[PDB]
Symmetry: C2
Subunit: 137 residues, 2 copies
Amino acid sequence: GSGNSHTTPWTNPGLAENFMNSFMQGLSSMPGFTASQLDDMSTIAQSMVQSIQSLAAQGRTSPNKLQALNMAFASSMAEIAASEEGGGSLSTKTSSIASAMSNAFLQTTGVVNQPFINEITQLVSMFAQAGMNDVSA
Amino acid sequence: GSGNSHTTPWTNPGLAENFMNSFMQGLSSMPGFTASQLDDMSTIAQSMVQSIQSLAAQGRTSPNKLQALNMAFASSMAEIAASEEGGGSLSTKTSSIASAMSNAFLQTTGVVNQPFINEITQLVSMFAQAGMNDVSA
């Protein structure tokens, strides 16, 4: 049985919250993103950290639950960009998130897990066709 | 998109928070899911609603962010399942979410966007091969 869980960007609330915080810091320096995006996406950033600490205050914090709130964030950063970047391109914004995600790993543990980044690129390129962002509004 | 939007499960915090509530109640009766999963995702369920009400109290609640949180929940549910079900099947759990998703839309606004459900099937079936949950740890 897979066990002996070691340190990860989601092994504790501290590294978990540090992830999306440092992500936004790097993402704000990405050419594929705009001020309009950063304004909105940073709202989710503060939502996730406040949700994580609420779990901690409830004592419901676990590695897997923190992981689920790690990818949750990463996925909720993909459709924002995928739908409307305003001043970028399909490829550019996809690369921007990937690069920014990478940096967050170096800010937490100092190393990149790897599979994480590889799946994020797929998210951005799939949520574009999702269409539930456009909803013919 | 442009102005003049129609009814949606994220058009207001009320339906937004009811989305995961009316979802979990149905997913708890799905064959492809286990109690182990249900405990973890019900934890996230209350995390999402607590995130929404926090944004509401701050006065930062808008259809965009509510939509992003809608996906954040859908993606994490896909994640949790895609990781490992324990007592199900790769396809069965994906079908379970798909069926439960359509249900949640019918519980809130009473209508399904349509492409939303389709995209979810991919999510629940992509993170599985990634395996950034197991990582031999």
